[PDB]
Amino acid sequence: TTTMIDGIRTALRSIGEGEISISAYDTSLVALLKRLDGGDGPQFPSTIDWIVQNQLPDGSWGDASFFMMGDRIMSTLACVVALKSWNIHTDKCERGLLFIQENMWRLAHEEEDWMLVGFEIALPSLLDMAKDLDLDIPYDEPALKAIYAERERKLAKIPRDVLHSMPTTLLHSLEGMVDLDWEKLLKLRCLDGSFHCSPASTATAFQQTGDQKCFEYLDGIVKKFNGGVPCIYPLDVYERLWAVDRLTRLGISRHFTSEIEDCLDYIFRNWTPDGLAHTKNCPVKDIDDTAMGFRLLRLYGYQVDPCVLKKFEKDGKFFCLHGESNPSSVTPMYNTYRASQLKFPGDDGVLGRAEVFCRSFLQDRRGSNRMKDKWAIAKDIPGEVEYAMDYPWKASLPRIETRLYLDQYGGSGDVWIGKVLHRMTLFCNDLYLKAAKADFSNFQKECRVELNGLRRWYLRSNLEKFGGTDPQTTLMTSYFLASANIFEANRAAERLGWARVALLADAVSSHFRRIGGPKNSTSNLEELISLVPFDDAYSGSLREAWKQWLMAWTAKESSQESIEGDTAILLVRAIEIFGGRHVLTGQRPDLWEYSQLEQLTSSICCKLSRRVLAQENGESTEKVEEIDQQVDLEMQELTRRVLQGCSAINRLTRETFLHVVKSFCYVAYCSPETIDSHIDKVIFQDVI
Amino acid sequence: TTTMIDGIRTALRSIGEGEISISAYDTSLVALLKRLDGGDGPQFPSTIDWIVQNQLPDGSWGDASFFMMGDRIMSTLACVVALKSWNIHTDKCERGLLFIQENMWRLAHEEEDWMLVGFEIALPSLLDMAKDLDLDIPYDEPALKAIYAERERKLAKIPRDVLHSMPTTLLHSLEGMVDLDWEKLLKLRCLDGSFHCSPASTATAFQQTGDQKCFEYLDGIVKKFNGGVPCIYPLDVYERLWAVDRLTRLGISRHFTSEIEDCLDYIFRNWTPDGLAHTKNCPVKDIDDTAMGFRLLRLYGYQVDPCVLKKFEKDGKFFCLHGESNPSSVTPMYNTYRASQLKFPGDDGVLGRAEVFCRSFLQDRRGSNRMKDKWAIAKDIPGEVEYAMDYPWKASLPRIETRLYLDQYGGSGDVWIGKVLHRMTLFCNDLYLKAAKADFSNFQKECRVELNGLRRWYLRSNLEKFGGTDPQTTLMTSYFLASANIFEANRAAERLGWARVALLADAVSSHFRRIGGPKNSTSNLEELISLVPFDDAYSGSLREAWKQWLMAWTAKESSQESIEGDTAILLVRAIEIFGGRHVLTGQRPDLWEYSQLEQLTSSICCKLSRRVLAQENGESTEKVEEIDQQVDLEMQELTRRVLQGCSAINRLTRETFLHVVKSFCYVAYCSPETIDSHIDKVIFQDVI
């Protein structure tokens, strides 16, 4: 059980500097490097070995878990083109020529989206240097020249002088780039001395000029890789934040807050006032990882500011590439949909404009079948937008969305797309599913007996002639609003308390709807506290705030204001006692903040109930739509002070407030024949 | 200066059991008592001495400060009728007969209201026993038989058997009551054994049957009075509560809270579940003193409940007499106007019904000249209603009303009315005016230099290009809202703080009206805290709540809610620091109560501003009138929790909240050409 925990604990404590599926095509592009100091043949033989003893029994080259010839052709011939330059091991040269010479024909029947990074740029250059060698391939295919045609298209639309001004993907893909003057190509290089983190871009003229200032990049990625090499490295930021994101989406990272805070610290001290990149020192910035990092850094309590994201505004448009206008994919903006929800009054309206832009911009691929990514395959991203569009953060239960993601994690079944087909292993690891499944299932097993015991305690308590028609459809939802809110095992005291403290108030409120209200009171309710379980301080401190609640009941009996805020503060003061939650108020900001907090609580809770019945009839559109926006435009400040670390307050007590306000915000914008199947979907039918 | 303080301190520490102006008419009514144990003549000679050596040089009898023959005739002849029964001192018998025999003619030219307590009942009985004696008076006056006529009227309308069931004024006035069976007249007697606290009612047949169970009353009021005696005694409750009421109306009792709490304790332990009377054990209850005591006991923090006042409802009517329907006077209901304002949600609607009844019921004598009392003369009671009707407790500055009462206290110039003309000395004492005048005048002298210094500090602070047109008409009212709110000398720190902390917020709010709001901010205001005076903690704790205020400024910039509550809590947190006001929050009810308190603060402060501009135009009647009632119907709960002692909170901090909410409630319902002359009236022109 804890075996998986130890495995991932070591894996994250050993967070390294790169873990990529080893490529085979770039390996030859560097294997052509002559010996630097007047040698005889190749520079490294071990890569050549890894080349020979890593061919599929059928003779193909690439990944075995998937079949995609459009890339398999490059992977299967570029390995051979080196054994022609060095005349070694004629066994598998012609053993693979039998494959390629008869199976290089299915170019024009792949697909219309799955084109590689300049697949029309290097493939010619590949066959271009292969032309001089002893090659004999089926040159005459109409599918190939139909690709040469776009090569000549793209080699002209690119600039000449200004092309020496962008560090961009054209500098990432230099194989199909001939006659490149090197006078300016040296100053715009990677901070550690690489060519866009790729060695093939070096090996254009690196073949004889061994500039160490770029050669330690290569020799490092050779000697410590020990057999084969991918094309792009390092990616520390890329892999790191991508891990923690999905892991927080798993809901089991709580055991690893230490290493969490460590990688957050790395990214934090690695922040630039102009953007972010795949790695630590790359000055080529984009929008997507910058946004998701700005999001997650804030989400775990760090001092963030998004005004830099104004570097993508093209007459209202936005794109991933910097100053470059190419059709973005679904996720590089979907992340921004996720990241735009948590506005603060100090923020800039760019997030809003971007939100209304991207919302409709994705509403195209809402119903249409264009839900696919441009640079990766996915299991169910429509499943992700299915939740993202109809559920904001203000009603985003952090457990039902995990219940949804259990059908969205593929792992081995999905291969990521780069310059070549490759996977990761670090966070694309295949026991995260096993661990999250087991964790959620034991959670399931505990709530199954908790609701059982609550049922017995309830119908043995004569609380049925108080309330109303059907107690089952109320006990289940009441237990849900708590269990789906607080799921840990070490707070079952609060878990059982919230249920009963809501049930009692619900019963008496339903009684006051019946006999009319506080003036027609016939019995003394103050003693109903007795039959909740007994403790040392859980009982008296309970009854006193309970009498405060009844005080309010009597207080408004000739008014028009609702009862939301009082029962809300009832529940939170109940939790404060149900957790032994106390504080050194030796500092005046303590009450300063606690005051405004429970103030906003009643404020929003009463401002929503005026929409409750007005929507139960719908007597006006402008009014209801104004109520909702007025709710959220200060729900922001609520979340803000709940989720800013500048305070000296305990985190847990700051956040349990948001817990219940979110519970009620959810039950507000979900109708019963919407919420009904949610309990089934969560608890009833188990995984595995 | 403190001489008056010592005088009244002794006077109140020596709060006794009765202090009434000594009568002269009842003295003879008991002087006719024969010697009990077989004596010769009268029972006590010293009263007879006090009779002879207390005649005016002109020969009249009564008070010298006022002239009212309708009673002076009784006082001047009843003293003589005894010297006829005992044949002593023929000097002043005939020396007063020269007066009476020629001056007993002005009966029919007194007035139409100033009739004594059954003046038509005893005057006949007086001349009735005088008939048998050697008298020779001008019997033939048509004004006298015109009074005999109503005597025969009233002696028949009274019942026979049920007249033995009410302890009432008919039992108080027994002189004109002949042939009274004594079998039931003994069980309904005063608890100490008196006849409605009057000895003449005994001396009807007490002349020979010396029942000690009623005779110790007489002998006590003889031996320890030592010369003369009034008719009604004891009145401990009557005089006591009447004192503390007017003294609290003086605003100098603060030096005497000890004796205050002592008399409050006496009245408190002297409460009955059925009503109150003049004295401790009298079972004859009324409405007026019961109501004013229920008021003042609550006002100083004691556990009260008014449901008993349902014993006056006569088909909607109310009256002072119990089951008796006689036209009440102005004050016995005016007190209830004063007492009905401070409703609580737990209260009964009797106060409301009574309020709408008595409001219009007095609106008759609002303009009409019928503003006079039935049992007392007054200096200016129209001055009292002049304030009571147009100013509720919710806008009742406790210093402007004292400024008004300085012209309402007459003291010696006014004689109270009972069965005979008499005054008090205890609380109708003539240095209370001197003390209150001196106290208010030194208050005046201190604020005169305080505003002077504030003016210098302000125009030296460059706060003029912020704000608006005329700074004088704002500095004066700002200083007023504080000085008229807090007047003591030992809190000048808070006094000077409130002024500047309101001025700064006012200036920046007026700036935000100008440039549009928080989004068009051009400078950093957070540093404006520096130029208020510097201290150890008065500065930082100030700036932080100040930044909280600015936080709210930014928070609502796209909303429709007002700014009242935030600046209100600003001012109160400023006072909390300007008084070193701190608390042991080791108890959860501390924040429980402080939270709801500042919640109601913002609630009411924002619910009033929506009426502010809507009244500046008046675009609807029902809406504005609903806003005001909705304000007060929870202003009640505000005042309630502010003014209930069931809490463990400090009183001062509970009440400073009410202070400012009242300041703004006043400035709301007073228009500038109403408030303008108030500052003049208070401070500009001094007393003396």
Residue numbers in the entry:
A (entry chain A), B (entry chain B): 80 to 767
Please share excerpts from the published article on this structure.
To elucidate the oligomer states and the interaction mode of OsCyc1, we determined the cryo-EM structure of OsCyc1 and finally solved three OsCyc1 structures in dimer, tetramer and hexamer forms, at a resolution of 7.9 Å, 3.5 Å and 3.7 Å, respectively. The dimer is composed of protomer A and protomer B, and the dimerization interface involves their α domains. The interactions in the dimer assembly of protomers/chains A and B occur symmetrically in α domain helices α22, α23, α24 and α25. Residues S674 and E677 are both located in the original dimer interface and form hydrogen bonds. The S674A/E677A mutant form exhibited the highest relative enzyme activity, comparable to that of WT, and showed a lagging peak position in the size exclusion chromatograph, indicating that S674A/E677A is present in a state of lower oligomerization.
